[PDB]
Symmetry: D2
Subunit: 183 residues, 4 copies
């Protein structure tokens, strides 16, 4: 039965909302169990005075647990053209998983919010995931709302639009179909 | 359709390459050998058309003796996985491979390649730009909706640094020398053999 | 006295207009001679039925002449996430310049229009130019309209906005100051 | 200001690095040697703070004997060119270098680094991700408005493929081995020496 983790970071809630649509799409696939988790905050609690959304219901993930899922869909804001420092720090802590090959051949996909360079954020995440041997799922133009990027769903952070959310649902279903078929 | 539907399916792998001096042709053979290890997989090797003048090619020492047939853009739609091989042009795919992929706009418009499996291998003269040749190709393939297969560190020859050695976590590679005089090494061929098998297992599993 | 080439490709005219602002900014620098040229079209004349802008006054450049300038500012639309095939084909034809080191240490900068991934188009052009040994000029946040990308001016192709054109003028001046100082 | 203004200027180069096992520290020395060949250039080597626990570092065999002083984020504003050195973390800069650059948000907000010269050198265990470590760092530096210096094929050692050899057109590199047991080679040190001289000439010319 396949297990999908929707793992995200969100400061203002935009990526949180997109992750909900990602998960919704993946749950459309029979026999797929979907879990939503957030990576730990890296800023001090009082600075996060920056207007951060402290009311986030998703449980906090640990790097250790990435090995328990068959597919992982990563969501992140952009920071100075790259993935958020929060998501980067989390992935920087997977050296034990790397050395043991624990993530090898698992399915990965990425969604992002525009800080702003959404596309480099996704493709640079792809580069990092390649080092673990993940199979990488772009979305192409399968969602008709693309006529969002072909690399993965995105939003411009002021809530995500219905069109952006439709593309995220498509991505979640697409990734989950592939993961379930590979399992 | 009462007779059009086959009782058995195979996963169809195309190894599509461009090579001027043969280095990628040789890796393409190892890619295919690896894919052939997988039960239920058909493997085909084809090359993209030459774009340079024939006299320039021959005067530059090019290898005109390449037996693989020339591919048509349209037929990529007939395969389940496509492993693309190319020399670099300043960190990008060859003009030859790029020109060929530019002729798949009709396949793009109809979604004909959507959800197929893709993987990339490359050559450079000195190593320069080998990684970006692969990852920039990924970007183009994402617009067709291909699933992208890197190799990670699955081939242990990637940890050997005792000799000049192509191969990256993004895909197999070979180092030809600035003049093309280096031959692909046994370690480079092994990494390419791993890539083909890996890609074919994934493709076969998705087709099963 | 420093020589800047503004070299662009444009199908619908958006990049042509941005190139005019690039050149305008560079001409603000005393002692800088600025030339605007376009790369040759690669499509057949009748297809370019696609609504192309045939009335483009800029002369057509040859790859050979890149060696005659001290700085080159490259403008291109995006194609399927990368530089236009027209600009790529032009750069693919610089192998003789590469082998002789003719472009080594010259100044380069890039502007793009969104097809759509403007940022990968610019940074992938940077990668190609590195192989020739160009010095690469981003624009950062020097133009206050950025608060366009920090990698170079951009437009969304439906004419370029005054804000986009202001950023292009800034880029042209910035690049030309650097080129003149290096000469 | 009647006395604050100096009669003579020097171009100030900072070689800023992170190194766990010393490979990048050794290349940083060659970078600096090269920059020192240029008349009118002051060269300073500094390292970014360690982020890992001291006991983990020492138990992993880390090199605690590094004489270069530890840099502060704020002082990057005092230099004219900065050559950044780092091991890779999965195709990205080290967490240590990244954490340090994250503390330059104040310099970013005031434009303090705008228009300075930047260049990058890197290490990997097997070569994997060496190119992307450099080019992804370029992207971060572009947000500060740095001028970016690749090295192209100016160092002829880049054409030698007879031995395992770091170095790319994006910047110098070294191959440490998966266990860190390889030492930087004379060819790798020469390429780094070229990079430092090249960067310093460019910086000196812009300061003149
Ligand atoms: Cl957010
Ligand atoms: Cl080849
Ligand atoms: Cl245009
Ligand atoms: Cl190191």
């Amino acid at each position: 039965m396949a297990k999908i983790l929707v793992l995200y970071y969100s400061m203002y809630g935009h990526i949180e909302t997109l992750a909900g649509a990602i998960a919704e799409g993946a749950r459309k696939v029979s026999g797929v169990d979907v879990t939503i988790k957030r990576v730990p905050e890296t800023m001090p609690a009082e600075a996060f005075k920056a207007g951060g959304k402290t009311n986030q219901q998703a449980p906090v993930a640990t790097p250790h647990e990435l090995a328990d899922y068959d597919g992982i869909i990563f969501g992140t804001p952009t920071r100075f053209g790259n993935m958020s420092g929060q998501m980067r720090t989390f992935l920087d802590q997977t050296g034990g998983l790397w050395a043991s090959g624990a993530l090898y051949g698992k399915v990965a996909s990425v969604f992002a919010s525009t800080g702003g360079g959404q596309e480099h954020t996704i493709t640079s995440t792809w580069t990092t995931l390649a080092h673990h041997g993940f199979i990488i799922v772009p979305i192409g133009y399968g969602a008709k709302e693309l006529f969002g990027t072909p690399y993965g769903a995105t939003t411009i952070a002021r809530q995500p639009s219905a069109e952006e959310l439709a593309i995220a649902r498509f991505q979640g279903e697409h990734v989950a179909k592939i993961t379930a078929k590979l399992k």
